Each structure stands twice: as C-alpha cells, then as structure tokens.
Scaffold this motif. Sequence first.
Motif, PDB file in Angstrom:
ATOM      1  N   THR A 184       0.898  -1.013  -0.064  1.00  0.00           N
ATOM      2  CA  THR A 184      -0.016   0.052   0.099  1.00  0.00           C
ATOM      3  C   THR A 184       0.677   1.259   0.225  1.00  0.00           C
ATOM      4  N   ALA A 185       2.126   1.238   0.491  1.00  0.00           N
ATOM      5  CA  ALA A 185       2.831   2.360   0.422  1.00  0.00           C
ATOM      6  C   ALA A 185       3.696   2.455  -0.880  1.00  0.00           C
ATOM      7  N   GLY A 186       3.550   1.571  -1.927  1.00  0.00           N
ATOM      8  CA  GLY A 186       4.297   1.632  -3.108  1.00  0.00           C
ATOM      9  C   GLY A 186       5.746   1.545  -2.875  1.00  0.00           C
ATOM     10  N   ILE A 187       6.374   0.893  -2.122  1.00  0.00           N
ATOM     11  CA  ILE A 187       7.714   0.747  -1.896  1.00  0.00           C
ATOM     12  C   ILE A 187       8.069  -0.805  -1.941  1.00  0.00           C
ATOM     13  N   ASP A 188       9.248  -1.064  -1.855  1.00  0.00           N
ATOM     14  CA  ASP A 188      10.116  -2.356  -1.938  1.00  0.00           C
ATOM     15  C   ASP A 188      11.199  -2.338  -1.227  1.00  0.00           C
ATOM     16  N   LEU A 189      11.583  -3.124  -0.025  1.00  0.00           N
ATOM     17  CA  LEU A 189      12.631  -2.759   0.615  1.00  0.00           C
ATOM     18  C   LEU A 189      13.811  -3.781  -0.220  1.00  0.00           C
ATOM     19  N   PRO A 190      14.877  -3.644  -0.369  1.00  0.00           N
ATOM     20  CA  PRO A 190      15.993  -4.746  -0.842  1.00  0.00           C
ATOM     21  C   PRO A 190      16.466  -5.284   0.715  1.00  0.00           C
ATOM     22  N   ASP A 191      17.173  -6.549   0.329  1.00  0.00           N
ATOM     23  CA  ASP A 191      17.622  -7.176   1.629  1.00  0.00           C
ATOM     24  C   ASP A 191      18.815  -6.606   2.359  1.00  0.00           C
ATOM     25  N   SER A 192      19.369  -5.702   1.628  1.00  0.00           N
ATOM     26  CA  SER A 192      20.299  -4.798   2.367  1.00  0.00           C
ATOM     27  C   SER A 192      19.663  -3.793   3.325  1.00  0.00           C
ATOM     28  N   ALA A 193      18.587  -2.981   2.926  1.00  0.00           N
ATOM     29  CA  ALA A 193      17.851  -2.612   3.749  1.00  0.00           C
ATOM     30  C   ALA A 193      17.259  -3.101   5.120  1.00  0.00           C
ATOM     31  N   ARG A 194      16.652  -4.277   4.685  1.00  0.00           N
ATOM     32  CA  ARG A 194      16.169  -5.172   5.617  1.00  0.00           C
ATOM     33  C   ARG A 194      17.441  -5.683   6.601  1.00  0.00           C
ATOM     34  N   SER A 195      18.602  -5.697   6.268  1.00  0.00           N
ATOM     35  CA  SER A 195      19.711  -5.955   7.152  1.00  0.00           C
ATOM     36  C   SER A 195      20.218  -4.987   8.083  1.00  0.00           C
ATOM     37  N   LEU A 196      19.568  -3.756   7.759  1.00  0.00           N
ATOM     38  CA  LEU A 196      20.195  -2.728   8.494  1.00  0.00           C
ATOM     39  C   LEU A 196      19.714  -2.970  10.181  1.00  0.00           C
TER      40      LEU A 196
END
Length: 297
Positions: A184-196
């Motif tokens: 719903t936010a129109g975003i997509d998190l890469p695994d690098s961002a998920r690893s922060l």
Amino acid sequence: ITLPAFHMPFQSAGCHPGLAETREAAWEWAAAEGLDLSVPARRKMIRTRPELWISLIFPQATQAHLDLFCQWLFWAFLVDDEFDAGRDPLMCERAIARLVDVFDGAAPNGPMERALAGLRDRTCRGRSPQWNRQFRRDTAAWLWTYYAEAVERAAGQVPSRAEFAKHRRDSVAMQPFLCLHEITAGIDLPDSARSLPAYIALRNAVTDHSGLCNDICSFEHNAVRLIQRDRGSTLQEAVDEAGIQLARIAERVQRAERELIEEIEAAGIDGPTRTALERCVRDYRGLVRGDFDYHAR
Ligand SMILES: [Ca+2]
C-alpha cells in the motif's frame, strides 16, 4: 482493574473512511468463498471488528488494498479461532503443513484453503522475490507458532518472559501486515535495507508494541500473567508493570528512527531504497498508534 496511563507519543494517522465498506466486502468475500461460520464465530468476528484494526493500520490505503488486507485479517482470525485438535500437536502439525503447502502452490481443497489461495494470488503475484521471501517467512512463522504452543503445552513446558517476547513477535502476526504495508505504500525494501540494524530494531519494536498492547487489553500465555508469575504480584501491579514495559517499547521506536536516519546518511543510502526506508520511519509510528487505538479504545 484499571488500565494504566499509557505512554503514547505517536500522533494518529487517522482512520480509513472505508471502514464500513471494507467490512461489507470482508463478509461478502467470506460468503463467496464458502466460509461457513458458526453463530458464536460470527459473533466473535463482529466483536473483534477486523475492519477497525485494518482501517487504523492503513488509513491512507486504496479501497482495493484495504479490502484485500481486511480479508487476510478475516482469514487470520478464522485460523486463530480454530486453534484455541487445537491443542493436539499431531492435529496442529497436519493442519499447519496443509495451509503452508497451499501457500506454496498446492491445489486448494476446503474453503479455508481456497480462500488462502485466492488471497495469495491477489497479493503475492507481481511482488518481488525479495518481498515474497519475507512475506512467506513472516506468514509461515505465525502459522507454526500454533504448533509450537501446542507442543510446548503438551510437554508441560512454560515460556519464560524473554522466550515469550521472541515467540510473541511471530504469534502476534503483525509482521505479515508490515509486509502488506510495502504494497500500500508503493515501496520495496532490498535485503540490504532489511539487514540494517536500526530498521530491524524499528520493525521489531513496532511488532513488540502490538503484541504487548494486545496482551494488556485482553486481561493462552499472556505477558501480564508471565509478569505476575515472574514477580508474584497482584493483577493491577502486573498490569501497571506491563504498561511501563510498553512505554520502553514506544521509546525503542523513537530511538530506532533516529538511528535509522543516521544509518541512511552515513551509509550514503539514496534513491528508492532511501525513499522506502524514510516511508517506514514516517509510517511505523502511525501503525503503533493505530494498533494502540484499537486495543485501548
Ligand atoms: Ca521519548
């Protein structure tokens, strides 16, 4: 018993104007899928008000996304209702493994399986493998928490206050809706961002606050009872102590945001990844507040 004065520094993002519409679509979806609810189950669903929670979590979402997410919640409530067979670990194992196989692509059978297949088709198709990997991880983890509790209860084992907090992250099922937020936010998190480290801390604090606030506003293993067990207190003393622990979680949300902004600038994060992480910094507050206004109000 009197609820404590909660520490809620997060402003409200509002409530979705299509609350009444998304509830009618939810039950219209349950009827079309052949979901035959009993009378006590129907009363329980109306009492739970899934349209209220989803509207407080995604107040700016489109009506199509809100209806889809509400039907996930409608389905998840039906899954929780059946497992509270529900205590026999052998039954839970076969039931959960059947739902996960349907998720992974096994041809559906019953109404709950065809409903899940329809939910997975409308939601997971089009999304990135990065998102589908996290969505399945959070959804499967939530489904297997019923098996974990069943085996833990059958063995006479009790969770410690720390082990329950880790288990409560998957059993509160807030994380699968943190994945829906990306849609719903129109975003997509890469695994690098998920690893922060700071995003992990933010995502977990948003999940912990939802789990503890749920247990507090609902008198099954409960965090307030475990506090009463590990401290030998009365019910009011455990409720106020639970409210103090919730204030710390709300403080963890504020520190994780600051440390996430610091990690964005220090790591030189830009482009869509920075936009996706900055969207979570701005939205996760309202998610905590929206979940809080559901349980407390
Ligand atoms: Ca503060």
